[PDB]
Amino acid sequence: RTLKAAILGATGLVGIEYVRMLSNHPYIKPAYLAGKGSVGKPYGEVVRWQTVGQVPKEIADMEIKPTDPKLMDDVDIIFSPLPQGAAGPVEEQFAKEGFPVISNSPDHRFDPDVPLLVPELNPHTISLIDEQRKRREWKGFIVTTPLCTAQGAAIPLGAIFKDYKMDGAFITTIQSLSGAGYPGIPSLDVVDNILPLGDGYDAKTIKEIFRILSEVKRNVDEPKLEDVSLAATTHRIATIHGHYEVLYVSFKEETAAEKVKETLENFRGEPQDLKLPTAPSKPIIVMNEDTRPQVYFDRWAGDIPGMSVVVGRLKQVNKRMIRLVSLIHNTVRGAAGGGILAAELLVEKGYIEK
Amino acid sequence: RTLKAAILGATGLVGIEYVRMLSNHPYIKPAYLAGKGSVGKPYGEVVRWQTVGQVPKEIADMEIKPTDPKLMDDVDIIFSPLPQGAAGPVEEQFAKEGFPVISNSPDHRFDPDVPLLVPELNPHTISLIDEQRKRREWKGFIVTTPLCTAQGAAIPLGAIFKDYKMDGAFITTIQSLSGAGYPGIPSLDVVDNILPLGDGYDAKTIKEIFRILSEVKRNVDEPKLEDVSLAATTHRIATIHGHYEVLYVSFKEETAAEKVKETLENFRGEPQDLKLPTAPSKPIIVMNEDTRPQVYFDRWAGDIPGMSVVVGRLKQVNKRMIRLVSLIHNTVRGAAGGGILAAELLVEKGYIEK
Amino acid sequence: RTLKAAILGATGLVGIEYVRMLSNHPYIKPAYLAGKGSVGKPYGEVVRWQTVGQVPKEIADMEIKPTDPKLMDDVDIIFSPLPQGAAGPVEEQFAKEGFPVISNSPDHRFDPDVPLLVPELNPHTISLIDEQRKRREWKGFIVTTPLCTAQGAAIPLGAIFKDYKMDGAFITTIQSLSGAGYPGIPSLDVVDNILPLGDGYDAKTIKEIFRILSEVKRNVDEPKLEDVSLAATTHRIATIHGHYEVLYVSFKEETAAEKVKETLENFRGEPQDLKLPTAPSKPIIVMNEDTRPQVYFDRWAGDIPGMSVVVGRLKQVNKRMIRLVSLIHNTVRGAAGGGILAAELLVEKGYIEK
Amino acid sequence: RTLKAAILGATGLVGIEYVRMLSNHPYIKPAYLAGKGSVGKPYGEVVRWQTVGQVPKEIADMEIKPTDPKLMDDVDIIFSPLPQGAAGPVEEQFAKEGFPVISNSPDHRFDPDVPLLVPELNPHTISLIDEQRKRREWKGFIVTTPLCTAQGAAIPLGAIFKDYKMDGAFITTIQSLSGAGYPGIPSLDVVDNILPLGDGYDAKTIKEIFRILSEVKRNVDEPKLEDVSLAATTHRIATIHGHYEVLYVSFKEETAAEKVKETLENFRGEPQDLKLPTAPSKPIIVMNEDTRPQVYFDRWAGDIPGMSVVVGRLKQVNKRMIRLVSLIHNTVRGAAGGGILAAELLVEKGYIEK
Ligand SMILES: CC(C)(COP(=O)(O)OP(=O)(O)OC[C@H]1O[C@@H](n2cnc3c(N)ncnc32)[C@H](O)[C@@H]1OP(=O)(O)O)[C@@H](O)C(=O)NCCC(=O)NCCS
Ligand SMILES: CC(C)(COP(=O)(O)OP(=O)(O)OC[C@H]1O[C@@H](n2cnc3c(N)ncnc32)[C@H](O)[C@@H]1OP(=O)(O)O)[C@@H](O)C(=O)NCCC(=O)NCCS
Ligand SMILES: CC(C)(COP(=O)(O)OP(=O)(O)OC[C@H]1O[C@@H](n2cnc3c(N)ncnc32)[C@H](O)[C@@H]1OP(=O)(O)O)[C@@H](O)C(=O)NCCC(=O)NCCS
Ligand SMILES: CC(C)(COP(=O)(O)OP(=O)(O)OC[C@H]1O[C@@H](n2cnc3c(N)ncnc32)[C@H](O)[C@@H]1OP(=O)(O)O)[C@@H](O)C(=O)NCCC(=O)NCCS
Ligand SMILES: [Mg+2]
Ligand SMILES: [Mg+2]
Ligand SMILES: [Mg+2]
Ligand SMILES: [Mg+2]
Known about the structure:
The structure is a homotetramer of 354-residue chains. Chain A has 354 residues and is of the alpha/beta class. Chain A has two domains: 1-147 and 330-354, NAD(P)-binding Rossmann-like Domain (Rossmann fold, 3-Layer(aba) Sandwich), CATH 3.40.50.720; 148-329, Dihydrodipicolinate Reductase, domain 2. Helix content of chain A is 28%, strand content 21%. In chain A, the strands form two sheets. Chain A has a seven-stranded mixed sheet with strand order 7-8-6-9-12-11-10. In chain A, strand 10 (284-286), helix 10 (295-298) and strand 11 (309-318) form a beta-alpha-beta unit. In chain A, helix 1 (15-22) crosses helix 11 and helix 6 packs parallel to helix 7 (199-213). The longest helix of chain A has 17 residues, at 332-348. Chains in contact: A-B, A-C, A-D, B-C, B-D, C-D. At the C-D interface, strand 7, strand 8, strand 9, strand 11 and helix 11 of C face strand 7, strand 8, strand 9, strand 11 and helix 11 of D. The complex binds coenzyme A (COA) (4 copies) and magnesium ion (4 copies). Residues 8-9, 11-15, 35-39, 46, 64, 67, 81-83, 86, 90, 104-105, 147-148, 179, 181-182, 330-331, 334-335 of chain A line the site of one coenzyme A (COA). Chains A, B, C, D: Homodimer and possibly a tetramer. Chains A, B, C, D: The active site is at 148 (acyl-thioester intermediate), 243 (proton acceptor).
């Protein structure tokens, strides 16, 4: 009745958050710590514990093991936050061996039969696993979570687009360094500097947000998603966790910032109704002070820390446009937290057997 | 035939750029270094030389002197980058004593008879000094330069609004710490954090930009400036100089990013035509690489370093909206450089006598 | 039964560690949040929670109250991290009123009848409290704990001095910003810079280390303390918590690094033997990798996190000299954690009573 | 007449200081920008100009060329800041071809017949070049300059060792990021952290200091060098240039701090006496304020900026021990500036010839 998870890239920056969260989870245990350049070594000795608290005592001494589908008979869930390009073949192997695969990597995010999942936003799309199982002829499956940076905007925008005639969002991000991994960003890129990431990163942000938005079940029907204008300009500075995003949001019809603020405050989905262990009770928190949120003080907010997107500064810009900022914890909600939540969602919908 | 300048707040962060630039200027000399908490002491011993190179040898040994209009008979130009609230009375005293006053402080920026001057943009408004002299009954005058952060956006927006039906701009800034002075920003506000400045700072940014824009002499006549929507969201991170601003710019009619890019590339005004010593030959530089400009590498650009606004990332967002970023050097163009340029402009229009 | 503690300076950097640690303590409650600037406001809306986790839900809504002894009669214990100069007389009045006062301020640290206490090193000096009550004519008392930066060195030099013929130490500190409070250190002192603190600060570090050393019960008696030579050169850089110190330690005779290392790993005193709730098991943890300790990763070490000094890099320099580094958490061990531990000890010794 | 220099590694951190300094040099021209990764592209579009000022207008359009001796026949002098392991054989081939090679790489720094040169301290070792040509059977030669971090200590300990009975030094370094190149140091090693470099790196610092010390002509002869005790504990933090070192210096007899201080302010050698263009007037500047030097403010010191070691904080620790700090610019003095100065000296001594 405890489910046994294998964490690929266990010692990485996303891996350690699977480690930290699961070693407190009521029924999903970090059982198998997969790696590659350090297999054979205790985890406690290779890991870069760039996160809160301490490596759990009962994890510190487990050996890092091979990422090999045929050695994991004992394993029920695979979480896969592996590098682009390597991740897609490994995830496929795993699904072909019968495993359910919850992946934080981009490789599979746009396969039409793979969900791109934000459990509060497009929970119905896990039914794509049925067409996936048939089309690919395998027993297991793959699910992906979006790009941390895309979830920072897609969540408050999902909630908004659900209930208002939102026809554009123009965003700037200032992201922290732990998203790029280790060695990831050279210190000389961000000491006394700001490092923009370029056109391919901006275009990949907007493209993930559009597929999320196109799967939101809406209460109004205008504008079409074809006519919605998105754009992002992204950057990295020297913060360790936490992506801060400034959004100007546009509408087809006059729309009051105070209305939007109430839909954000009260936003909830099936993770809240179902009470999944990792579901924050306010997946969006709204702050009211004109100097918040601040990366350092607000990235660990919520009853489940780091799982809430904290949104602030709602203000009317003109009748048809408002401004807000949102701060997500890029490796908890943006990555490991989100994938946990997804795994709980699939256990409760019977896709992963208990 | 050399003009003798007094630099108020000479040892401050803006003062030292008046010092650094003027001690190379062909005919305006840093002659009188005014201070207050350190009067009587050599400049070389109190100054925080938080800028490029070294205190000039021939300045290092001059005494810091009183900020007292009646002791400056020998002085021809006053540059005044004093703190809000103290600056306005001192500047007035100075004008009443017969001095021309070029001020970087906010106190006077919205007196209807005081120019708010960006020499490339609204050069004709120095004629407000005539109505000022009459109304206030004094011999000298006051000129102000805008808020460094407002010039970072007002310049590329001035150039744009001059020639296109620009109906909005939605901006985010990420400003460096030297604008707030010393002690200015507590280290704990920006180490591993981003510090937003709040509603009063955003509203003061947009209000300075609107008065600039309303004084641009335009080649088209739509929309009215009443119907133009501005908004800013401002922040400070741990960079030392350089304010980086992301602008989404909106239009009433279909407008191509490649058109706008040519008007920006070729933008010039009377400072360029007149050849003032401190006028960059491209007051706007356009970079083409999707990871530029970067604060650290581009804040000292241009044939007159730090005087050019470097604008990058021009890209079409939809037919009616484009995105660009601009980087200004907040204490050269945003402050001392700008005020120099203003002083050269007034010497050449005969307002300051040679 | 429960002791009720008042925390003076409760919203400050050191105050918050009192609130965070006391909120989990089996018997010392944070009952009375004292202040002055923000008296009458909820703690949670004023505090800067620049620490691990979130303000405790039970503390957040508590009103900040006057720092006034005649209003605290239901209070047992007063903890005082007030700024120099202000602390001294406030501590006195509290003592005089009948309270035990545990202070982290420098004011009384050299009164002959006042302990300067690290519970692991000079625990019998608590008996100064009896001459203290009689010559001060009060029923309360004052106890202080040492400057954080003096503790980061004295705890390892205490353990060394107890057992070896130690004749000097020559220390370099690289201290974090939280020790200076907020607004404390200007961000322009330490971005792309290192800030030395100067002679006063080096002299005061050394002077506290000597007082503590003079109170260590030793198992040898060579050399005399008056013949020991201590020096410190101190600095701050842009870390949030944690003070890293390099120590070159000298001896009167051939002394083996491997033996010191072991005397450090085996260090233990009264708090450990009594099992006080805030006593770490290993008040000195010794690390072996030639790249540790690192501030970010080792400052929250120990089974009571922040309470252990972590020491690394033990090495033979020549036969009479060894080198080590140590890392202390400056506001847990260095201030609030050590005051809590002091209060535990006084309870167990019956100096503080239900 | 003009010497034509090839700069190997010309786009790197140390390379750029060659280009910047050589572009103003009266007689050594940066004629041949060598590389490998970016051969055939303009320098200005590849380089990272992480230094003062802007790429020189004459250098920007120059093609990056092969690092190939048979293509440089018009070249006089080769300067080689190549990475360990790769430098050694490339330097050899250049020598063998007939070039003088001045190297900043560690490869040849311990060859018995190769100088390890700081022109102010062991200038006669240049005469190793004659046995070098004969036993290597080449017409060119190799000369190296020491690790920047070894220079920051050896220049002041050289001046001290020449005149006083110095029996050890015990050093703490706090080094900047540019010494590791780019991508060099991961930003997560040094944001909110300090990175020790470990034993290898401490051993190699000390070992270079000893070789240089062994070559200082002394005016005393106590103690023997083999009896001198050196130690280093080194680290990197998030500054861009400048390596700050604290030195506790030991002596065999009562030695007065005030006298050392003066021997440091009066230090001078051959480069000063010959007036070489890159020789600062005061290769050691001594500062008096108990808060200086500071990396940000004192690393570009001297009438040739970056070429002086700045020393502060001189102080008596006990009668046989003093403390000081020093600040070296690691890629000007510590690498390119010192190679230029070495080349000057060799020209004046006739080792390099028109
Ligand atoms: C998570 C991420 C940030 C990399 O972080 P990192 O901290 O640099 O992780 P790493 O590449 O160092 O390695 C983690 C472990 O995975 C292993 N790994 C790398 N490639 C592997 C592969 N092909 N197969 C198996 N394991 C692999 C590493 O060897 C290391 O293992 P070890 O402990 O055996 O030594 C990066 O993988 C990534 O960009 N992932 C896609 C998910 C994402 O969007 N992340 C950013 C979220 S904010
Ligand atoms: C320029 C500015 C950033 C302050 O910088 P700072 O580096 O903190 O300057 P300071 O307040 O320290 O002092 C500069 C000197 O001016 C003096 N000064 C302060 N108040 C004064 C007054 N009322 N009259 C005369 N001088 C005064 C100071 O005593 C000091 O003098 P000293 O050298 O005698 O000791 C701040 O004045 C400001 O915000 N100014 C308005 C202009 C602006 O927008 N600046 C930001 C531009 S990016
Ligand atoms: C902790 C310390 C670093 C300052 O930090 P801080 O976060 O800047 O502290 P503050 O100035 O903010 O003190 C905060 C509270 O104490 C209150 N306080 C200040 N002076 C006071 C006084 N004379 N009486 C009562 N309260 C006082 C402040 O008003 C504030 O209260 P509030 O919540 O009503 O607004 C500083 O007090 C100090 O240096 N203390 C000596 C103790 C120490 O431990 N130093 C080094 C720690 S590693
Ligand atoms: C300067 C140094 C710090 C590295 O910095 P960098 O900016 O990272 O240097 P690179 O790896 O970028 O070297 C840059 C150029 O040299 C070229 N280079 C590298 N290996 C080479 C080789 N074997 N042969 C020829 N060129 C080589 C690179 O391709 C690049 O050339 P490009 O412009 O064609 O692309 C590093 O080379 C080093 O540690 N050198 C030893 C010298 C030193 O002075 N160290 C400490 C200085 S304080
Ligand atoms: Mg990696
Ligand atoms: Mg000031
Ligand atoms: Mg305070
Ligand atoms: Mg490189």
